[PDB]
């Protein structure tokens, strides 16, 4: 139960790493779900993001089998590394 998306973040992390993501989460609330993405820097543009967001959005929904009215987004952070606080730079409200 626990681990029921950590398969899916894995898979996630290992095809953006290239392009700076550290970590993924799969954050349910009761209002919606957000993918959290950590990069290790500020390269990516909006647009960027917003491609790899979409696409790991319709992913989820495909796998675990989401319905259309469950509302959906995405965060892109920036965490240099542990010894630097979190800021967040894109929030892709839920869909
Ligand atoms: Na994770």
């Known amino acids: 139960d626990s681990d029921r998306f950590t ?3 894995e ?10 993501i550290r970590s993924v989460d799969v ?4 209002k919606g779900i957000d993918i959290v993405f950590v990069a290790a820097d500020r390269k990516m543009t909006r647009a960027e993001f ?9 992913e989820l929904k495909e796998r675990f089998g989401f319905d259309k009215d ?4 995405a965060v892109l952070d920036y965490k240099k590394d ?4 979190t800021r967040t730079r894109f929030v892709l409200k839920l869909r």
């Not at 954050?27 to 009761?30: F, H, M, Q, V």
């Not at 917003?50 to 319709?58: D, L, Y």
């Not at 542990?82 to 606080?85: F, G, L």
């Open 50 to 58: 917003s491609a790899i967001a979409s696409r790991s959005i319709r």
């Open 7 to 9: 398969a899916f973040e």
């Open 70 to 73: 469950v509302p959906i987004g």
């Open 82 to 85: 542990a010894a630097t606080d």
């Open 27 to 30: 954050a349910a609330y009761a």
């Open 11 to 20: 898979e996630l992390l290992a095809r953006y790493a290239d392009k700076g």
